[PDB]
Amino acid sequence: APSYRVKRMDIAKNDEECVVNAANPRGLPGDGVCKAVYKKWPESFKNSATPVGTAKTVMCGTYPVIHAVGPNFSNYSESEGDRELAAAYREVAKEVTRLGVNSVAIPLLSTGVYSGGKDRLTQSLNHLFTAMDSTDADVVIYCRDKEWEKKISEAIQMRT
Numbered sequence: 001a002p003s004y005r006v007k008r009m010d011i012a013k014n015d016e017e018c019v020v021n022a023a024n025p026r027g028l029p030g031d032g033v034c035k036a037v038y039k040k041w042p043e044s045f046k047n048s049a050t051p052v053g054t055a056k057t058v059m060c061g062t063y064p065v066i067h068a069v070g071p072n073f074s075n076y077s078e079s080e081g082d083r084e085l086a087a088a089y090r091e092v093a094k095e096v097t098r099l100g101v102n103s104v105a106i107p108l109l110s111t112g113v114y115s116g117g118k119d120r121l122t123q124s125l126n127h128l129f130t131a132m133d134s135t136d137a138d139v140v141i142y143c144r145d146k147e148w149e150k151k152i153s154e155a156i157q158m159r160t
């Protein structure tokens with residue numbers, strides 16, 4: 001039965017059948033999760049540009065990298081950002097289904113440099129749940145912060 005799990009570690013060392021990059025719409029290497037991903041899978045950045053609110057898969061050998069572009073909340077209104085954040089996750093679910101993978105390593109989109117300085121753990125995680133609930137893949141969420149690890153775990157546990 002497919003599960004949700006959380007791991008506090010570098011997403012570039014995931015043990016899943018594909019990864020989601022928290023990407024920018026320019027397809028450029030960038031900072032944080034995107035930097036790790038670039039160093040691990042540089043060939044997945046060939047023609048990886050995709051607009052805000054979308055996701056695009058680029059293969060690195062046979063390993064799929066799903067570049068998903070959450071909104072930068074600095075730029076977006078709360079209502080328009082929320083729409084785009086939801087859309088990005090929906091496109092992730094679609095790519096995951098099309099690939100036929102049994103598992104996916106995913107970050108919380110729009111929670112770091114794109115958070116607009118707000119805590120958006122709950123907002124982002126709930127959009128992730130809504131989209132990925134219709135898939136049969138194991139989902140592993142990767143975070144860096146110990147407190148976030150606990151709150152994500154609690155949110156996972158409380159739906160069971």
Ligand SMILES: CC1=NC(=O)N=C(C(=O)O)C1
Nearest residue numbers: 022070110111112113114
């Ligand atoms: C480049 C980024 N894209 C994204 O979806 N979320 C980000 C974040 O703030 O975690 C950064």
